[PDB]
Structure formats: structure tokens, C-alpha cells
């Protein structure tokens, strides 16, 4: 019942209690753990929204009371009555805060407590959607001091009028495969990228092209719209030693933007809302550009720098991976564009683990996410003991939109 | 049931049915993942079916399922539990069994050569200086001058638990650590406790920075007893750099042989506590680990010094800069003297071959993510990428309490 995780390096040991209060599942058993798989009605509703407004009631220490009590029927006759309710403004800040503090994939949860969180349930166009997620971008951007923020769209009611940003993320390189069989942009964007061409954006066919919004309200046929490119801040890449970087053309966005994942807050769904923080070097200059089916541009790097790329043994990709890293640090931090390296990032993570041990019980922590995917044990959370378990408010994955979609 | 799991790189989809053969639970739950958790005398009643379950994997991977042989086998153990309370394993039997706790050791990034291991039988050791004997003569076969081959030497069985046979050394061979009155550390800070057992013992500590420890072993349940590794049969290879002349002044050495000893090995439900094997390193163990963690030899300041890197501040990497080059290191040394080693791309693309091999000849492979993927570079390896399911087959390597904290003393 009492769980204890040991930091290996430290030895020290903290005990979670709050795994106790999970409710939704893990995909794991008694017999195999899925802990490394990337996907593992009014009677049902009240539960949840019982269970939301108690922890909301006792965070601002009025559990019991009778505002607690009198919110809890108001909530329950609605749903009685409408099948559904509306949240407070103080209840959608506190979900939104704590879906993100309860996100067991994110290092950066120290950060928590200072989201701004833009209420957009009056949204009702495509439009307006546009509207509110270029205010949402310009915010969060602030001219390179970046501000984490999330707007919150219309939660779903029947399921046929769902809102929803089509893209993954908000600002993203379009993907086009060549006839040369080889893939011109980001080969992650591929699908989505002719999903618009299909909607009838005008594709550039360059390697960082901009891709269009494809909003969705009230559960239309969604609308493309281009970000206001002077909205759109970007970062080209150089090296702080190597010349020749700035020539490999490479550049990337400065604004992290989720926007394709699910919140639920006390049983409500809000399918479009999305979120925004500031990288985490490993990001762009490990998974974006490294990853084989990225933009995959270890060998080039190499390449440049003059190394034995004959055998693996001579670590010529980490090498040349180290230099990738250092050059968007490098970057980031020369255009005053926020911006966190992996050691940083990870050494805050501990320190925010051990305030939610020691003032929550726990921190739910999924560690194959929270390892950095590069150094992995030069880092703290490494030798972290880590336990994953569900709470909500929470983020959660939802089927992209172009395959459930009624035209 | 049927269970797939995905390569994100390649998107190949693979399909796992041997996790319905798992019995042993794994320390998640519906509601909890412990995946990154280190470490989440038997009954006639309960040994028979552990027995009859082993021999019938036994008698099924020699096509013999059901024969004679399998039927008699069967009875004669049956016959022996009843009799003796336990029962004795078969030759074969015994290196089947030690090249399948290999194969389903799901923390092991190196079972592309579960099959090639070399079994060495000293079920008729009675005594700690037998056992020092078949360990030397291990740890000799084994490094065969830097051609290393992967061997296990495996003892007598537990019988009533108070006559075990165990190595109280974590690996055969290690560096002594000691902790200094002033707070810090000479050697290997992660054998401190074990050194200070062995000067208690009567070891006469040299107190360096790589002093080889001695054997302390434990038979047949008697008081632990210490030895020291003839100094010849112990490979080192001295550490240096190809490019930078001053990493070989930082005097650093490892030694080639990766030798666990104080796992538990279960075979059809007999424990053999004492079963030391080894294989050869990759790279990252001693680059990244033995060197790097700030609680082993830590030596990541030094050699960014020495690099001149910018160590004002994380964002410049050196940590980063520093860990590939030490790295780099260790595979050119150890290459440059002909002691076996593999780095970890080579590595974990042979894993992926494997693991895929696995899927479609046996059904599965179990692997512990957290644990195959490399402590350094992750995601450009491809292990990275893949999914992987992670279940407990038996036979099987398995943690036991260390000795000093449940042996009961003699004196
Ligand atoms: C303030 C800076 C932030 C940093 C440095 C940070 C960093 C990270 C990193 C490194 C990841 C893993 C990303 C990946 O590998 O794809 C992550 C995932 C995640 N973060 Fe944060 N984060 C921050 C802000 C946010 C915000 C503001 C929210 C929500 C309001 C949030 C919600 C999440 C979620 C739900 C995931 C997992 C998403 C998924 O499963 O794809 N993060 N974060
Ligand atoms: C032939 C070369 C081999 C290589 C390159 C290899 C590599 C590795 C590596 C990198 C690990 C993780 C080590 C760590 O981080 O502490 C590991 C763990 C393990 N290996 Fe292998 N291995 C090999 C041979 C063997 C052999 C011969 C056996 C058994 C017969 C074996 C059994 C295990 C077990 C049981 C674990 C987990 C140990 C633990 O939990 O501490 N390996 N191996
Ligand atoms: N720094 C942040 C803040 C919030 C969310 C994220 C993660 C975003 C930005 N990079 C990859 C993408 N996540 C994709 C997860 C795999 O599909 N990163
Ligand atoms: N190459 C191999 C072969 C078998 C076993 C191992 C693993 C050994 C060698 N390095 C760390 C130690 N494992 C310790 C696990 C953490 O306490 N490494
Ligand atoms: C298969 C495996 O789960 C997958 O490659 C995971 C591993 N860890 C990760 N960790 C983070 N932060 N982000 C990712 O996309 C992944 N991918
Ligand atoms: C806490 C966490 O489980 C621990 O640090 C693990 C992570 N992955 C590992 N992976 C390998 N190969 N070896 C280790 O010792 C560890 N330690
Ligand atoms: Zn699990």
C-alpha cells in the first residue's frame, strides 16, 4: 500500500501514498509491465465531478463546508438536468494546473503552479479559434521570454461537436515525400501535411515550412489558417566553435505548443486545448533532429566535422550528436529565446519530486519519459526511482480527428 | 491473449505470445507501473510442478515431448522429490537450464549469444577452497587472454537454506573501495561496505585506487572464506585515449571480465545461490557507469578539466562532451589490446536482431526497457525506439539478499 522509490545515487528514499488515490489504469499487471508502450452518462459523470470538486474544495482548504457541499448539489442537479455541467473559472484554473502537475511524462512540472490558463469555452467559429490560439501564441512567446499557457476550448457534449486543433502541435514543419522516394521536411508531419494540401493550403515544398492551422468548432469540417508568420518566432541554428553549422540551413521554432491531447477535469472533456511551455534542448537537437525518421541529420554533421564514420566504435554519432545539442543550446540562448538543457531540466524535476513527496504524498513519474534521450545517467533523474500511476485532471491521447471524422 | 508491441522508427509491429508462459509476477499492477524500480527453502507440494513445468520445456526443445524418456524422467523426479525432498538435475538438463535464465533474463542487452554460453559444472564442490579452484579456473577459461567467452560456474543447489553455497562478492572481480575519515573515497565508492567485510575478514588492504578484491566464499553454508584471484589471471587494461595524451595520466585501468556472482539461478524451482557467469563488456558499463555516476570513480570534472571545456555553466555540455570522450576511451584501449568489448550501437543493434529473432522463432523476447537502453546516447540507438514487454520466465537470474545481512555466523 506504502510504495518507497530510492534515488540510487543519494540514497534517498520517499514514500508515496498518493498512488492510493489513482483511479484510471496503467496497462500493466501483476504478470507484464507495458511500462515502455507509448499508447497502452449522468451515473458516470457526478462520480467524477464529485471526486474533481472534493480535491478542488480541499486545496483551498474548505472541504466540508458548506460552499463545498451547496457547489456539489449545484453540480449534481445540472447533471441531473443537463447531463452535463460548467465548470468554474476557479475550478477550470485549478484542473488545468493540476491535469498538467499530474502529467507523469512531463520534466518540467516544477513549473506547475504558473500556468495561464486562457479560458476560450465562449469560442464558437473556427474563426474564433484562429483568434484565440494566435493570442495564446503571441502570449506564451513574449518576444522570446516564454510563458507557459494553455487555452481552453469548448468541452465535447455529444461527441458530434467536438472542437479540436487538427494539428499535433501548434507550430510544426510541413513533411512531403519526393519523387526521389526521400522525404523533403519532417517525415512526422507527412500525413497531416497533405490532409491540408487536400483542405487546400498552398505547400511552399521547402524543408521548414510553416503548417497552416486546421481548426475545428462545434464539430464541423475543420478550416485551415495560417499563423501570423511576424507571430511564428523561429531560431536559426549555429555552433558556438563550428563555422559550417549555420551553412547545414538548420532552424527551429521557439514555442513548444501540444495541442492534439485531451483534458479531462472533473469528468468533462475538453478536446481542444491547447498548451505551451519552452523546450528542453534534448527535444529538437536529439529526437527532432536525430531520430532516423526526423529530420535525421547525424551522418551530415558528421560529415563536416571530419570523423571515423567507418566504425560504430569510434562513437562518431555521439559525438556529432553532443556538437547537434550544443549548437541549439547555443542558439536559443544567443536569440534570448527560453530554453532549458536536459541537466538543468532533470536536476529541477528531483528537486520538484521531493516537494510533491514531502507536500502531496507523491509525483507520478513515467521514467522512460523523464530520462533524457541522450546522457541518460549523467542526469538525477537516472538513478531516480520513479512509480507511474493516473490521476486526474489529466492530459490524455485522443484519436487524430482525420479518422473519426464526418465530413 | 495477444500482445504487440512497435518499433516508432520502423513502425514494424510485432506480436508476443510467450508472455502467457510467464508466472512470476513483475511488481506492477492495473493501477501502478514499478518499472523503474530496482528490485520491486521450498515444499515437496510446490517443487514438483516447477520441476514437471522445466523438464517439460526441457524435453520439448529436444523434440522429445511426451517420449519415453520425457514419462521416465518425469517419474524419476517425482519419485526423488518425494523421497528426498528435492532432486538433482541432469547434466543437460543443468546447461539448458543456465542458457535459458540467460535467455530470459529481460535486463540483458546481450542475448544475441544466450546460446554460446559455456557451463561448468561444480555441483560436486564441497568446500571454499574448491570453489576458489573452479572460480580461477573460470575467470582463466573465460578471459582466454582477452578472446573472452562467456562461461557460468555453477554450484551446489540449496538444500535446507542453512547450507548454501554463496560468492559474497557482487562480481569476481572488483576494485575495493574505502572511505577515508575525511568524508571521501578512495577506489570504487560502490564496494566500501564489502571491502571493510574483507579487511574484517583479515584481507590486508594495499588501499589504492584499482585494488583487485579477494574472493570471500561461502560453502555449504559455513563461515565465508577469503582468497586472493592469482594476480596473472586477472586481465586489466589500462586506459587511454587515441587522441588526447594526457587521458592515459589520469591512471586509469578496468579490468576486462564482467563477472555477476551474487545473483540466485533457478532451474524447475532448484536455487543455485552460487553461480557466477560472465561475458565481456559493452563500453557504456565502464565509460558511463564505473567512471561517470557521481557515486562510482566520478571522474567526469577531471576530464573536463583537462579538456578545457566551458564548465561555468550545464548549457555548454561539457558533462555531455567530456562522457563521449571517456567513452571513446575505454572502446579504443580495449580494442587496442585485444580485450573482447562491444560499444553500444553495435550492441543494441544486435539486440533489435535478436529480439526480433525471438518474436518469430520463440514468440517473444522480455526485455526491460529501462534497463537495455544505453545510459548515455539513448535515443540514437535503436533499442530506444522499441517497444518492449517486460515479463519473468523461468529458468532465471534472480536477485537474493546479500549474504552478510542473513548468514547466520559460525565462528
Ligand atoms: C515550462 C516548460 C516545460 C518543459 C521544460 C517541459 C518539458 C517536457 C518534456 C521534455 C516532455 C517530453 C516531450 C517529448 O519527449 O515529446 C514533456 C511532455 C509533456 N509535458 Fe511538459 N514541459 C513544460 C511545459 C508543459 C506544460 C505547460 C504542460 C501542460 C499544461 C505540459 C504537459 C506535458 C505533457 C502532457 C507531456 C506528455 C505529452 C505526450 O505524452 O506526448 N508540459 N514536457
Ligand atoms: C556476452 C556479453 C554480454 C554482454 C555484452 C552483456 C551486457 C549486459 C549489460 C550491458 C547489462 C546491464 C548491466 C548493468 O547495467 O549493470 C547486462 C545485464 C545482465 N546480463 Fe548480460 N551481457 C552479456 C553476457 C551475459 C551472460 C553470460 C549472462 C548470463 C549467463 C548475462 C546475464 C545478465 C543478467 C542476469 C543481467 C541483469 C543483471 C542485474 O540485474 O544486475 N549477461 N548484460
Ligand atoms: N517542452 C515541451 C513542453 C510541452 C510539450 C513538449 C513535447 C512536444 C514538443 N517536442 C515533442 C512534442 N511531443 C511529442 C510526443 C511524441 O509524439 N515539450
Ligand atoms: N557485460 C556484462 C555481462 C554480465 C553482467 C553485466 C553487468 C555487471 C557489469 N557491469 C555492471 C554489473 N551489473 C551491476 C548492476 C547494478 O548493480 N555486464
Ligand atoms: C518505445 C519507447 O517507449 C519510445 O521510443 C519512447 C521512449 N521515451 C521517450 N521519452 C520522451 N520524453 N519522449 C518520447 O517520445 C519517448 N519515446
Ligand atoms: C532507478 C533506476 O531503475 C536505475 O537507476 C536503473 C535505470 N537503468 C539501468 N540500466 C542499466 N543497464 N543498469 C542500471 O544499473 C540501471 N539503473
Ligand atoms: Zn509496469
Request: glycine share 6%.
Amino acid at each position: 500500500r506504502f510504495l518507497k522509490v530510492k534515488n540510487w545515487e543519494t540514497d534517498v528514499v520517499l514514500t508515496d501514498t498518493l498512488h492510493l488515490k489513482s483511479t484510471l489504469e496503467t496497462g500493466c499487471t501483476e504478470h507484464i509491465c507495458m511500462g515502455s508502450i507509448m499508447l497502452p452518462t449522468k451515473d458516470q459523470l457526478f462520480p467524477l465531478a464529485k471526486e474533481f470538486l472534493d480535491q478542488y474544495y480541499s486545496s483551498i482548504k474548505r472541504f466540508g463546508s458548506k460552499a463545498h457541499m451547496d457547489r456539489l448539489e449545484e453540480v449534481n442537479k445540472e447533471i441531473e438536468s443537463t447531463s452535463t455541467y460548467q465548470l468554474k473559472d476557479t475550478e477550470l484554473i485549478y484542473g488545468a494546473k493540476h491535469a498538467w502537475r499530474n502529467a507523469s511524462r512531463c520534466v518540467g512540472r516544477i513549473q506547475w503552479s504558473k500556468l495561464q490558463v486562457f479560458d476560450a469555452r465562449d469560442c464558437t467559429t473556427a474563426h474564433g479559434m484562429f483568434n484565440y490560439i494566435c493570442n495564446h501564441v503571441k502570449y506564451a512567446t513574449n518576444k522570446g521570454n516564454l510563458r507557459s499557457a494553455i487555452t481552453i476550448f469548448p468541452q465535447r457534449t455529444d461527441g458530434k461537436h467536438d472542437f479540436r486543433v487538427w494539428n499535433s502541435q501548434l507550430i510544426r514543419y510541413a513533411g512531403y515525400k519526393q519523387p526521389d522516394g526521400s522525404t523533403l521536411g519532417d517525415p512526422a508531419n507527412v500525413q497531416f501535411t497533405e490532409i491540408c494540401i487536400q483542405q487546400g493550403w498552398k505547400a511552399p515544398r521547402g524543408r521548414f515550412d510553416v503548417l497552416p492551422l486546421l481548426l475545428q468548432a462545434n464539430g464541423n469540417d475543420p478550416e485551415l489558417f495560417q499563423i501570423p508568420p511576424e507571430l511564428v518566432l523561429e531560431v536559426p541554428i549555429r555552433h558556438p566553435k563550428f563555422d559550417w553549422f549555420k551553412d547545414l540551413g538548420l532552424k527551429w521554432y521557439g514555442l513548444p505548443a501540444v495541442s492534439n491531447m485531451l483534458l479531462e477535469i472533473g469528468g468533462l472533456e475538453f478536446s481542444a486545448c491547447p498548451f505551451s511551455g519552452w523546450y528542453m534542448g534534448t527535444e529538437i537537437g536529439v529526437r527532432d533532429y536525430c531520430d532516423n525518421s526526423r529530420y535525421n541529420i547525424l551522418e551530415e554533421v558528421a560529415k563536416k566535422m571530419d570523423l571515423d564514420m567507418r566504425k560504430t566504435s569510434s562513437l562518431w554519432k555521439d559525438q556529432a550528436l553532443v556538437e547537434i545539442n550544443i549548437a541549439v543550446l547555443y542558439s536559443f540562448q544567443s536569440d534570448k529565446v527560453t530554453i532549458v538543457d536536459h541537466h538543468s531540466a532533470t536536476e529541477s524535476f528531483i528537486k520538484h519530486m521531493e516537494n510533491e513527496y514531502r507536500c502531496r504524498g507523491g509525483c507520478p513519474a513515467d521514467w522512460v519519459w523523464i530520462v533524457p534521450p541522450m546522457s541518460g545517467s549523467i542526469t538525477p533523474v537516472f538513478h531516480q526511482e520513479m512509480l507511474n500511476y493516473r490521476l486526474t485532471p489529466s492530459f490524455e491521447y485522443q484519436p487524430d480527428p482525420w479518422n473519426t471524422h464526418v465530413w
